[PDB]
A paper describes a structure:
The high-resolution crystal structure of an Acinetobacter baumannii protein previously reported as being dependent on the type VI secretion system has been determined. The encoded protein, which is classed as a member of the tautomerase superfamily on the basis of sequence homology, represents a putative effector. Structural and sequence comparisons reveal significant conservation with the tautomerase superfamily of enzymes, which are not generally noted as being associated with this secretion system. Members of the tautomerase superfamily form distinctive trimers or hexamers and the crystal structure indicates that AbTFM forms a stable assembly that belongs to the trimer group.
The structure of AbTFM, with a single subunit in the asymmetric unit, was determined by molecular replacement and refined using diffraction data extending to 1.75 Å resolution. The resulting model consists of residues Met1–Leu121. Due to the lack of reliable electron density, the first two residues (Gly-His), which are remnants of the TEV protease cleavage site, and the last eight (Leu-Leu-Asn-Tyr-Gln-Val-Asn-Ile) residues are absent. There are three other short β-strands: β3 occurs in the loop linking β2 and β4, and β6 and β7 then form an antiparallel alignment at the C-terminal end of the polypeptide. The interface between each monomer creates three identical pockets lined with positively charged side chains. The shape and the charge of these pockets would be consistent with AbTFM binding a small acidic entity. Each site is primarily constructed within a single subunit, with a combination of primarily nonpolar side chains and basic residues, in a relatively small depression formed between the β-sheet and the two helices.
Residue numbers in the entry:
A (entry chain A), B (entry chain A), C (entry chain A): 1 to 121
The structure:
């Protein structure tokens, strides 16, 4: 299970949401063997005055937070991150300079999905 | 201490915010013995175009993120999650299919509350 | 690396965003020796009806979430929190009663920055 939040300037979301959505999901399919339908994304559309970051990232600075189950090795997580960079550059033509990713991890017993404790599925 | 974020489509928040607020808080009172006043909730109201998830969850798909102190056992956390499901179904008549929960945990030394380091209280 | 999210009522953000931005960043410079430019802040502007908390915090209740790399000692984290309280009180004249802070920690291998795996920098 992966829950994804994508924070960006409003205009970046307007223009790129669809392209980002597919790029991110393709990374998860490729790396983690997710089913095509298992896509869960929240785009957090910020007014620029509320999104403050260094001038060496462009108007298309994007922060991706992926909340996942614990357990993947550091090397597997690094590869996932590289694939997200790649897919976003290739499909969105946003430079890796403008993309930032953080993975958060929690044990399965911390999740409820479809009325079930996730450890029980 | 529990900080709760509730992400949903705008219309779901409009119609259900009050009912969800009470249902969630009642779960915390029941399970964790919280005082009635110790309710801290942020409803994150999303335009549907920014909230992308599978078609087997309805317009009332809700994601609840509960940030709490570390230490509760896996079994206690699972029970908490079940009580949230129950209370939301009973009080909101939203099906468990549409409810998703993730607990995040941090040590007390990671928190500041009312000007104090939380470990010191 | 520190990613900061600041949640507040809309009017609190309007009046205090600049003052909070400097106060928080100064705390990070002072405590963690951050460069002056390494400021990354997202202000999450909430309508009051969506921001529910006890009546003993004022209209200027602010929640600061700082996502950082793992490894700092509990004592170093507590000091950081105290400095944030101080700077916000001194520079914003918001009482510590109204300020809440939580630090989240993840290993470096969980981050992508400027196209790089953060552990590799
Ligand atoms: Cl996805
Ligand atoms: Cl609550
Ligand atoms: Cl900062």
């Amino acid at each position: 299970m992966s829950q994804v939040k994508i924070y960006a300037n409003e205009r970046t979301i307007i223009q790129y949401r669809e392209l980002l959505s597919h790029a991110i999901h393709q990374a998860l399919i490729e790396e983690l063997k997710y089913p095509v339908e298992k896509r869960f994304q929240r785009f957090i559309s910020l007014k620029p005055e509320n999104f403050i970051y260094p001038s060496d990232r462009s108007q298309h600075y994007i922060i991706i937070e992926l909340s996942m189950f614990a357990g993947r090795s550091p090397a597997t997580k690094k590869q996932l991150i590289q694939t997200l960079f790649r897919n976003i550059e290739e499909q969105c033509k946003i430079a890796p300079q403008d993309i930032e990713i953080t993975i958060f991890e929690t044990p399965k017993e911390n999740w409820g999905i479809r009325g079930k404790n996730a450890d029980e599925l």
